[PDB]
């Protein structure tokens, strides 16, 4: 029932880039939002606003993040159009 | 005479990561720390800071000193042996 991004992030927009990535990872994990927050040792409503672009996120939640999904911390800033460039072109 | 990073970072030190990084690019732009900090409209010694791994950068600090540097954000992420290993293997 966990549902993906509707839409592609503009790349310049960080935040946007991040909030797709978190999202397409943490779904192809299984998890909710609440789970991931939960892995990360993270409160689930600063997860959820930051899916929602509201936090400048810090560098340590990042890496934690990244642990949690088991990714590089760079791919949660790499934008999907590129990542799919990349992988299939 | 500016000076390059002087070993490889440990991958999974994100902070040592973006420290490797900054401070090759910047030396590739032909700018100092205090040269960098301005770019960003940052403080000279908080990037001076920063590339001793000292502070826990916020997202919007990463985007700036990205842009300032000519380079995609998850690129001062991106351990430079994963760089080299793409650029060249």
Redesign the interface.
């Known amino acids: 029932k966990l549902t993906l991004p509707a839409e592609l992030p503009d790349e310049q927009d ?2 946007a ?2 909030a797709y990535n978190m999202r397409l990872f943490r779904v192809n994990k299984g998890w909710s939002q609440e789970e991931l927050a939960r892995q990360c040792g993270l409160d689930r409503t600063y997860v959820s606003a930051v899916e929602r672009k509201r936090w ?5 939640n ?2 934690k993040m990244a642990a949690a999904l088991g990714v ?4 949660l ?3 999907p159009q ?1 990542r799919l460039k990349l992988m299939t072109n």
């Open positions: 960080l935040r880039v991040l400048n996120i810090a560098l340590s990042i890496e590089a911390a760079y791919q800033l790499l934008p590129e």
